[PDB]
Design a protein around this ligand. Structure first.
Ligand SMILES: *SC1=NC(C)(C)N(O)C1(C)C
Ligand SMILES: [Cl-]
Ligand SMILES: [Cl-]
Ligand SMILES: [Cl-]
Ligand SMILES: [K+]
Length: 164
């Protein structure tokens, strides 16, 4: 297991434009295209991202290319953020993947707002952090995914992704 395999489980793989859990147009392995309700806007974002006129459908190689860029962007967002970077630096590699997962799903600004959870993670108070992380819109709206990510923070193991 690694961050790529973890996010591939959590986001799935779909080669045609679809709507994500929040109703937003998305493609590939959780590549958000736009928050606009306009399918035409989503299609224009897709063509710009891929560099060709798509019919709303991409190949698996194209999906994996966007995915690599998106994982990279999540890491860069963590490293450039004054609240996320010290927490990331304090974590082991498994828990770092858990943080990248959150940033991939919610963005740098959203995760940086989890001030109390981030403090508990920096303190390595894993059970307390797990309780605090669940008191969130994130957990209530995507509880099975959030439970997997939280278990990863709680244990520092890949147990929540093993039989998946
Ligand atoms: S991509 C795309 N743009 C329009 C609105 C024409 N679509 O119906 C697609 C094929 C999803
Ligand atoms: Cl892009
Ligand atoms: Cl330490
Ligand atoms: Cl709490
Ligand atoms: K998804």
């Amino acid at each position: 297991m690694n961050i790529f395999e973890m996010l591939r489980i959590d986001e799935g793989l779909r080669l045609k434009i679809y709507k994500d859990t929040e109703g937003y147009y998305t493609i590939g392995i959780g590549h958000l295209l736009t928050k606009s309700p306009s399918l035409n806007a989503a299609c224009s974002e897709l063509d710009k991202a891929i560099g060709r006129n798509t019919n709303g459908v991409i190949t698996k190689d194209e999906a994996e290319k966007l995915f690599n860029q998106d994982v990279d962007a999540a890491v860069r967002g963590i490293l450039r953020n004054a609240k996320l970077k010290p927490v990331y630096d304090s974590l082991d590699a498994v828990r770092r993947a858990a943080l990248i997962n959150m940033v991939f799903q919610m963005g740098e600004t959203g995760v940086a707002g989890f001030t109390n959870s981030l403090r508990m993670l920096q303190q390595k108070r894993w059970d307390e952090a797990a309780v605090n992380l669940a008191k969130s819109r994130w957990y209530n709206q995507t509880p099975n995914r959030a439970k997997r990510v939280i278990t990863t923070f709680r244990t520092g193991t890949w147990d929540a992704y093993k039989n998946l």
